[PDB]
Amino acid sequence: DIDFDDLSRRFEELKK
Amino acid sequence: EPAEIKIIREAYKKAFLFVNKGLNTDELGQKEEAKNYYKQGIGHLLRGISISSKESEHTGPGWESARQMQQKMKETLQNVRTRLEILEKGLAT
Known part of the structure; x- marks a missing residue:
């Protein structure tokens, strides 16, 4: 259940 | 079955492993650890992306799956x- 899309979401959140 | 596809698949799995570790440590504020994992992840991502995957013989669900892996990478x-x-420039909010 590898989900690279989830990684992108977490990077976006780190910017906040 | 093609060896180029397993290289892509291995890179995909390893890159996720390290980028996930990087994000975990980054979220926990462990920035030196994060940079370490991120750099390892970059190495795996670069390798997976480097594999030619649009040539004439590159047909079928396996190659299609490999291309999509490279898209993600x-x-x-x-x-x-x-x-x-x-992080390297110390600009993390």
Whole structure:
């Protein structure tokens, strides 16, 4: 259940 | 069955492993650890992306799956490289 899309979401959140 | 596809698949799995570790440590504020994992992830992403996957023999669900893996890897490589440069320059919010 590898989900690279989830990684992108977490990077976006780190910017906040 | 093609050896180029297993290289892509291995890179995909390892890159996720390291980028996930990087994000976990980054979220926990362990920025030196994060940079370490991110750099390892970049190495795996680059390798997976480098494999030629649009040639004449590159047909079938396996190659299609491999291309989609590379799509994902290119997107993540962009994100990891951005975060890495941000951490290296000490600009993390």
